[PDB]
Design a protein around this nucleic acid. Structure first.
Ligand SMILES: NCCC[C@H](N)CC(=O)NCCC[C@H](N)CC(=O)NCCC[C@H](N)CC(=O)N[C@@H]1[C@H](O)[C@@H](OC(N)=O)[C@@H](CO)O[C@H]1NC1=N[C@@H]2C(=O)NC[C@@H](O)[C@H]2N1
Lengths: 144, 200, 63, 117
RNA sequence: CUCAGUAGCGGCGAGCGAACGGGGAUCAGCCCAUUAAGUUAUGUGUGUUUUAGUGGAACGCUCUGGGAAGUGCGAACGUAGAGGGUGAUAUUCCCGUACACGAAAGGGCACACAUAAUGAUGACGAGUAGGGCGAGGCACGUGAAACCUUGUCUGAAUAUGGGGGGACCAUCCUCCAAGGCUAAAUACUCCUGACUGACCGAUAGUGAACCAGUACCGUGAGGGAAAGGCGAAAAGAACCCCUGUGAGGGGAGUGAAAUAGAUCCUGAAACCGCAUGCAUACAAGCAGUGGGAGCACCUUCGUGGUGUGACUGCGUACCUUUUGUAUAAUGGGUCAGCGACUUAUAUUCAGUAGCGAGGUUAACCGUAUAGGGGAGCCGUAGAGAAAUCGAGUCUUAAUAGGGCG
RNA sequence: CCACAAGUCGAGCAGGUACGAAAGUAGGUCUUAGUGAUCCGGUGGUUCUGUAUGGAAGGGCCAUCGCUCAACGGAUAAAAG
């Protein structure tokens, strides 16, 4: 035990890799699982993803819709349970960023009623949902 | 946990660093990762594009009765390119911080319970003499051993340099392969305390 | 290299909780001849069929 | 990690050629021909392990027929008579006795025709 | 390194593909005519480095053997147990290694002074900014197209002034173009020194281990090979015999070995001889297979072993491609050697290990697989085109109904 | 009903209607053919967005218009020997 020639991995951790075209007995000899002839049997034989043989594809016979909002890319959603990572009792955008629950380039945050909290927090400048506000006040915090 | 040094003194060492249950799969993964990270991986071959010459078509496509050929450096031909030419490779693996620490803790605990770890209050040599170090180790009955000290004295390092099956390392420079390879590990109490603080 | 999104498919599909939603065809024009029921029932979003979900996943790997 | 094939390939070819000993011409000298010849020999042996049982049963039946006709019976009637007499000696032993012991076979035929009567 | 294959561009196809912000490496500013930082030369001084080199520990007996470094028994050195060689495998036989020393004379670099010279025809920027026409560059294909460059035609204001903030206007914010110089972090290897390899070992590895860009081919540009090994030491065979004073061989001699004798280690296969045993000149075919007499040698004397195989039942090769092949459809004269599912990145699923409502670092630092580095990524919440709300949300006049959760 | 994209029938609820004295009937025509996806554009509306801010341009959403794309799942805006 505990020698360089007495260490082994757990069962099922390692498998042999598949080797094609090495005889009848291996079961993947000759054609190597590619079947007989055709486009897919050639080297680099697959067709482009989304190609359906020539008919108008699924992503082209359907219409485009919608537009992308720019403010959504900078609005951040925060779970209530994530407040436990905040050091101190003041919950603000800066302290959430310091706790790494909000990415540094975000300009605003919203707190949703997802988990549970026990500490009493003071929330300054962050939007709260109706459930999250009740949860904070029940736990003993206040808003601004 | 309570351990006994060679002189009968009692030492208190944390169970986290020196008493973890042995996890062979974790230890094996970390050890093989260390061995793989030891590789150099310097080599290459020449593909059909790299071999000298071979730009022109050797003979015409039809009419000669030969098998059709495109270049004399084809990988089918003797002296042609290698089909899949190798390039230098990087053999390092990622090891999770917690996985490395847990493997080292398991190794240390297993050494303790197999009685291959020997604790000493102090381990120093007066002069850089190979014979001095040899006699000192023969007294402790650890002629083949890895010595771990809090700091590596120059005299000790010089005395140990020429001895086969003996190496001396700092407490902060232990590695899983060397902990397993040597027959015994002779550790000073200060080095043991430093390793305790590091928790493996 | 990183997988590249097929941008047309990205413009046609958006992800829901357990699938992908899409708009319906046959509402862009030629609308007078269509009955009121078709006009109101071809409005809104529907789900991508399970036969096409795999292709959509291959085309849009990051949504 | 370059691997040279010579030792193992030579061993395999030599084993095939050793199994092909005694065959005519290229069948015992040339690897391709010899390899085709060994596989076909195995196929023939597999088929003939089944054919052998039929051939030996036919031989036993012919010898029993000759003995029965020496004793005044046909093979089919003698088999039927033994069946009715409850004798369960098989055709191999019956043919052995027919070939090597005429008196015992005469007694067996007498028992068969006594059961037939 | 991230942001991010995101925002966008695109016969809105195939594809192309940012920036802002954040984390690191390195950090540095100085001037426009009395003119700066800096750079380059020459000389002097100091320091360091480099071009020859010197010393450098410690082993005996015994057995096998042609030969000892190998066996068995004891001993010594180690700041030296890296490596190479010596008749087989050596810390103590040799060259070396650790370590301690060493330079008439020359070269490189670093710092400090001295003198030159440069920076430096330039003094706040007019045929310039802007505009019309045609093109080019920007992730951005004329698009709602800002911004940069200009071939052509024009053309300001000039600090109460001018440029930008993606058509454009107003307001705010921010900078000062039409004059310059500037180290580091970055890119590379013809070449020099040291060291290294889960890189090759003569069809491999450079085309080339060898008198190779040679022989050879071509008018020429150009193309382009094959070819390594006696033995520890030549001790490379005096002399005799056959033969043409040839080639070649038989003795002799050397050698541990000559079937190591010169294209000489080992010495496979295809292919070609000689010798012995059995079968074979009245019998029709993929050449075998299942039976089976006789003969020869051996023998444990047999219900045995080896070789052969009279006679007999059955039996039209292999691969590929095909509805289907003995097919008179394809491919292979034979042997030996080589010859085809790989590598990097991303992503998804399954096993397995760590940790677990959490998991995990990247670049980078680090005498460095450790330890630091939390930027970022994934999970923890959906609905909606979106603004917005949020265990709900969208649609609607509707708390009805319905869709996604 | 159906590979997808599509196609078909529909009781019932709310609002506003028409015809009936009323119970009621009516979401085109006895039914099954009379048709064309996506892209790009035009028109009406809009308690959506709007690249510093207020606007605007542009975009989104709802309704609707431009095909013998008839080789009628339509490879190009654009093609004979
Ligand atoms: N019982 C039967 C009795 C029968 C009776 N007696 C009849 C009989 O007996 N007839 C004998 C006939 C035999 C045969 N016909 C004679 C023959 O052949 N003479 C050959 C005469 C000339 C010979 N060619 C020269 C030769 O050898 N050059 C080589 C060559 O340049 C090269 O080698 C290779 N490979 O490239 C080089 C590489 O090393 O070495 C050289 N040489 C070296 N030697 C040295 C060595 O050893 N150490 C040191 C160094 O000097 C080495 N270099």
């Amino acid at each position: 035990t505990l020698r360089l020639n007495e260490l082994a991995p757990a069962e099922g951790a390692k498998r042999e890799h598949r080797r094609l075209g090495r005889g009848i007995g291996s079961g993947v000899g000759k054609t190597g699982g590619r079947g007989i002839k055709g486009q897919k049997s050639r080297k680099s034989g697959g067709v482009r993803p989304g190609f359906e043989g020539g008919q108008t594809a699924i992503y082209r016979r359907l219409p485009k819709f919608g537009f992308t909002s720019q403010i959504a890319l900078k609005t951040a959603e925060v779970r209530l349970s994530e407040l436990s990572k905040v050091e101190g009792d003041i919950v603000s955008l800066e302290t959430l960023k310091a706790a790494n629950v909000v990415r540094r380039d975000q300009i605003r945050a919203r707190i949703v009623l997802s988990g549970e909290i026990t500490r009493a927090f003071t929330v300054q400048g962050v939007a709260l949902t109706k459930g999250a506000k009740a949860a904070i006040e029940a736990a003993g915090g206040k808003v601004e | 946990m309570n351990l006994k040094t060679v002189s009968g003194s009692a030492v208190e060492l944390s169970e986290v660093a020196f008493g973890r249950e042995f996890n062979e799969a974790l230890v094996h993964q970390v050890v093989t990762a260390y061995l793989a990270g030891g590789r150099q991986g310097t080599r290459a071959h020449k593909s059909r594009a790299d071999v000298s010459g071979g730009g022109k078509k050797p003979f015409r496509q039809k009419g000669t009765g030969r098998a059709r050929a495109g270049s004399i450096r084809s990988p089918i031909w003797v002296g042609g390119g290698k089909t899949f030419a190798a390039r230098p490779q990087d053999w390092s693996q990622k090891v999770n911080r917690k996985m490395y620490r847990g493997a080292m803790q398991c190794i240390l605990a297993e050494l303790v319970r197999q009685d291959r770890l020997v604790l000493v209050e102090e381990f120093a040599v007066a002069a850089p003499k190979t014979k001095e170090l040899l006699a000192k180790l023969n007294d402790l009955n650890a002629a083949r051993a890895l010595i771990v000290t809090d700091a590596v004295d120059e005299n000790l390092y010089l005395a140990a340099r020429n001895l086969p099956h003996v190496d001396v390392v700092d407490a902060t420079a232990i590695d899983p392969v060397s902990l397993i390879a040597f027959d015994k590990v002779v550790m000073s109490v200060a080095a043991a305390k430093k390793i305790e603080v590091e928790l493996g | 290299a990183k997988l590249k999104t097929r941008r047309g498919a990205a413009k046609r599909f958006k992800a829901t909780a357990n699938g992908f939603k899409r708009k319906q065809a046959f509402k862009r024009h030629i609308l007078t001849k269509k009955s009121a029921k078709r006009i109101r029932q071809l409005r809104g979003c529907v789900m991508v069929h399970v036969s096409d979900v795999a292709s959509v996943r291959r085309m849009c790997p990051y949504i | 990690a370059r691997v040279k094939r010579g030792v193992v390939a030579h061993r395999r070819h030599k084993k095939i050629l050793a199994r092909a000993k005694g065959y005519y011409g290229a069948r015992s000298r040339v690897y391709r021909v010899a390899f085709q010849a060994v596989i076909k020999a195995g196929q023939y042996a597999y088929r003939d392990r089944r054919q052998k049982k039929r051939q030996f049963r036919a031989l036993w039946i012919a010898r029993i027929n000759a003995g029965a006709r020496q004793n005044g019976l046909s093979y089919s009637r003698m088999i039927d008579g033994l069946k009715k007499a409850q004798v369960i000696i098989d055709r191999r032993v019956l043919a052995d006795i027919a070939m090597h012991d005429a008196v015992a076979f005469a007694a067996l035929a007498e028992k068969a025709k006594g059961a037939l009567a």
